[PDB]
Design an enzyme around this catalytic site. Structure first.
Site, mmCIF file in Angstrom:
data_model
loop_
_atom_site.group_PDB
_atom_site.id
_atom_site.type_symbol
_atom_site.label_atom_id
_atom_site.label_comp_id
_atom_site.label_asym_id
_atom_site.label_seq_id
_atom_site.Cartn_x
_atom_site.Cartn_y
_atom_site.Cartn_z
ATOM 1 N N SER B 31 8.080 -69.284 -57.935
ATOM 2 C CA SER B 31 8.765 -70.532 -57.534
ATOM 3 C C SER B 31 9.089 -70.488 -56.036
ATOM 4 O O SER B 31 9.036 -71.515 -55.379
ATOM 5 C CB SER B 31 9.996 -70.804 -58.355
ATOM 6 O OG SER B 31 10.971 -69.802 -58.152
ATOM 7 N N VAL B 34 4.507 -66.852 -52.679
ATOM 8 C CA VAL B 34 3.432 -65.933 -53.063
ATOM 9 C C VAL B 34 3.901 -64.508 -52.787
ATOM 10 O O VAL B 34 4.649 -64.294 -51.858
ATOM 11 C CB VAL B 34 2.151 -66.206 -52.252
ATOM 12 C CG1 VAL B 34 0.924 -65.606 -52.916
ATOM 13 C CG2 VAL B 34 1.956 -67.691 -51.983
ATOM 14 N N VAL B 35 3.378 -63.543 -53.548
ATOM 15 C CA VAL B 35 3.575 -62.128 -53.267
ATOM 16 C C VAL B 35 2.197 -61.476 -53.084
ATOM 17 O O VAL B 35 1.334 -61.627 -53.919
ATOM 18 C CB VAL B 35 4.403 -61.429 -54.363
ATOM 19 C CG1 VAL B 35 4.702 -59.978 -54.029
ATOM 20 C CG2 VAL B 35 5.699 -62.160 -54.626
ATOM 21 N N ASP B 143 20.327 -60.904 -61.500
ATOM 22 C CA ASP B 143 19.077 -61.145 -62.231
ATOM 23 C C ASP B 143 18.502 -59.825 -62.752
ATOM 24 O O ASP B 143 17.279 -59.586 -62.659
ATOM 25 C CB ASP B 143 18.062 -61.950 -61.394
ATOM 26 C CG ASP B 143 16.931 -62.554 -62.213
ATOM 27 O OD1 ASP B 143 17.133 -62.795 -63.424
ATOM 28 O OD2 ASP B 143 15.873 -62.840 -61.632
HETATM 29 O O1 LIG Z 1 10.619 -58.837 -54.892
HETATM 30 C C1 LIG Z 1 9.499 -58.688 -55.483
HETATM 31 C C2 LIG Z 1 8.986 -59.815 -56.309
HETATM 32 O O2 LIG Z 1 9.739 -60.971 -56.377
HETATM 33 C C3 LIG Z 1 7.675 -59.597 -56.978
HETATM 34 C C4 LIG Z 1 6.958 -60.642 -57.757
HETATM 35 C C5 LIG Z 1 5.563 -60.496 -57.703
HETATM 36 C C6 LIG Z 1 4.702 -61.401 -58.314
HETATM 37 C C7 LIG Z 1 5.243 -62.522 -58.955
HETATM 38 O O3 LIG Z 1 4.377 -63.386 -59.521
HETATM 39 C C8 LIG Z 1 6.634 -62.712 -58.991
HETATM 40 C C9 LIG Z 1 7.508 -61.783 -58.378
HETATM 41 O O4 LIG Z 1 8.858 -62.019 -58.462
HETATM 42 O O5 LIG Z 1 7.001 -58.411 -56.785
HETATM 43 C C10 LIG Z 1 7.444 -57.351 -56.033
HETATM 44 C C11 LIG Z 1 6.663 -56.187 -55.925
HETATM 45 C C12 LIG Z 1 7.138 -55.124 -55.143
HETATM 46 O O6 LIG Z 1 6.451 -53.957 -55.055
HETATM 47 C C13 LIG Z 1 8.356 -55.248 -54.519
HETATM 48 C C14 LIG Z 1 9.105 -56.428 -54.649
HETATM 49 O O7 LIG Z 1 10.340 -56.651 -54.058
HETATM 50 C C15 LIG Z 1 8.653 -57.452 -55.394
#
Ligand SMILES: O=c1c(O)c(-c2ccc(O)cc2O)oc2cc(O)cc(O)c12
Ligand SMILES: O=c1c(O)c(-c2ccc(O)cc2O)oc2cc(O)cc(O)c12
Lengths: 348, 344
Positions: B31, B34-35, B143
């Site tokens: 939401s 992107v990660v 959370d």
């Molecule tokens: O904060 C993260 C995160 O929201 C997420 C995350 C990734 C994919 C997704 O669809 C949603 C997420 O909250 O992945 C992380 C991975 C890490 O190694 C370290 C992180 O702080 C996160």
């Protein structure tokens, strides 16, 4: 304690009137605000009052004022109220319905039993009717899940609720991809499609069906690509063609796996028509999925069209053949399948 | 393919510098945005890059800049960039961890097994340490759930992530009621409290422990009051006093007797696990163990044994490197938390 407000009726003339209600009790909180239960003084009927904090017109209200169907929660009235300074609340007065498909499924799961297939047919059929109705307006629900399917235990009537995510989809006007509840999210959405259609609801409906057959969610994905991995573990890896159809703008990383046979997914005695219906709802290619009215006409629902059909409690089947022109509009000749001779309204 | 950006170090003097990375792959869309996963060029280290749509200072950035703990995903760097047309995105460069508690628990569940007790001890201990560290700054995570607990399976290291809901709680300043994930949501939140404290994270942690012992969520509530009904089916109906404690301001719930904790879990569940869980899942927020108290609970006695070893034979991760900050809620507890064999 009696409360009186000026409210506009959900249907009929856009004319406000005095409406009074009592026995006001909170039945829940939400991100949108609060939901109460109350009794209309005039009729005595129970209602829910969804109170939503409001730059833009409320999309949920615009959508709800257009809808009137036996398988959708009816907006009885709406009215405005105030909260801090400049805070305005929209109040939706809706039909009260005591139970949900989520709670019924959880009851069966905890007892280590699956829901009898007759109930699965009844619930899914009513959901498809509701989808056929809303889709005729171009309205896509975008939050189909067990939590949003309200049930009256005695009558087995199902009503779709929570139009807070709903939107009229207009071809060429892009829409947000991160939108349904994750376990029920259509694969085009996971692939980042913004040109998706109402067929996303059909995928969701397929997930509900599968869930009711399995006794738990069929694709219980974690965050990230893991949701898509769960889907691939059943349907197999999508072809490049399927990817194109899901999202023509697909920005190129998932595992390569062959599809697991649908029959092996479910328990050994699962009726073959149920598996066949699932396989036609849970397709990668959005246009390959059955439309809601086609789903209603599927052989999995043949038992509901049998004149000798009764619910396990001996009570009468809820209305199944009072079709609206909205529902039938995508394929009117299918009414000869959907409404068998015994249910047909007669010329008199 | 090398990307080069100008980024500020998460901790240290706020001096922008150049950072280069390769092998960028999307691992998630949420939401917030992107990660990505990427590889830092000079050192070769895998990192995650969490891109958040920004507008008003970013709360999550402000919080992460204060944190440096072995059981919390560290913010290495942050930089700004540009999907949305006129929109600026905050990019957080973070520790990368491959697994989650959610995925490990699901694995054991599909095998009709529960997580081995030693791992329950290791993961829950690391969670409590992470909670003790952030609570010592007055920061509440808000959370805590299996999805937000990252795991390195080879080392058994746990790291808390996703400070997207986190806030510094300040007494007298109101906070939103509807905030944690529903199954892990403390009962004062369900009762609409706005003056809650950091103990809501401890409730959530108790739900995680209960889930690892049960093999599924302990309170899988529907929307609305059904979540409280789920809790009541175990803890029994809360008393007037318990309700006042949860929220001294202002539902239809049935008058049910409490279900005994030993009956809730499977017959050979270790009694110290049940005792810990009963002290986390309490109606009255003050009656719950604090995180530092939890770390020192007797259920974690085996971890302080000098002969303790992981089942793969490897040594356990760092467990005893407590700082003054971390110990600050009850500094005397260090005589338990730092065992003699780990002292100088
Ligand atoms: O904060 C993260 C995160 O929201 C997420 C995350 C990734 C994919 C997704 O669809 C949603 C997420 O909250 O992945 C992380 C991975 C890490 O190694 C370290 C992180 O702080 C996160
Ligand atoms: O839309 C509804 C709703 O959001 C909810 C709802 C209630 C409590 C809550 O915590 C969250 C909800 O979405 O309840 C309804 C009940 C009804 O009988 C009819 C409805 O349309 C709703």
């Amino acid at each position: 304690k009696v409360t009186t407000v000026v409210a506009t009726p959900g249907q009929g003339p856009d004319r406000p009137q005095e409406v009074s209600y009592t026995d006001t009790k909170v039945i829940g909180n939400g991100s949108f605000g609060v939901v109460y239960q109350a009794k209309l003084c005039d009729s005595g009927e129970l209602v829910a009052i969804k109170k939503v904090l409001q730059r833009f017109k409320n999309r949920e209200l615009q959508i709800m004022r257009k809808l009137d169907h036996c398988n959708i929660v009816r907006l009885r009235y709406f009215f405005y109220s105030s909260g801090k300074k400049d805070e305005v609340y929209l109040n939706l007065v809706l039909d009260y319905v005591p139970e949900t498909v989520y709670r019924v499924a959880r009851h069966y799961s905890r007892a280590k039993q699956t829901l009898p297939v007759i109930y699965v047919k009844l619930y899914m059929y009513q959901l498809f009717r509701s989808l056929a109705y809303i889709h005729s307006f171009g309205i896509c629900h975008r939050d189909i899940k067990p939590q949003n399917l309200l049930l009256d235990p005695d009558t087995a009537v199902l009503k779709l609720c929570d139009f807070g995510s709903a939107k009229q989809l207009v071809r060429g006007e892009p829409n947000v991809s991160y939108i349904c509840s994750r376990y029920y999210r259509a694969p085009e959405l996971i692939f980042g499609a913004t040109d998706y259609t109402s067929s996303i609801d059909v995928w969701s409906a397929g997930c509900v069906l599968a869930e009711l057959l399995l006794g738990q969610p069929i694709f219980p994905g974690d965050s990230g690509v893991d949701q898509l991995v769960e889907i691939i573990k059943v349907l197999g890896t999508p072809t490049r063609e399927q990817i194109r159809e899901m999202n023509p703008n697909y920005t190129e990383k998932f595992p390569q796996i062959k599809a697991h046979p649908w029959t092996k997914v479910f328990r050994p005695r699962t009726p073959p028509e149920a598996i066949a219906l699932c396989s036609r709802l849970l397709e990668y290619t959005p246009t390959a999925r059955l439309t809601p009215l086609e789903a209603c006409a599927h052989s999995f629902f043949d038992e509901l069209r049998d004149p000798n059909v009764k619910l396990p409690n001996g009570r009468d089947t809820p209305a199944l053949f009072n079709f609206t022109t909205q529902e039938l509009s995508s394929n009117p000749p299918l009414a000869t399948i959907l409404i068998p001779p015994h249910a047909r309204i007669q010329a008199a």
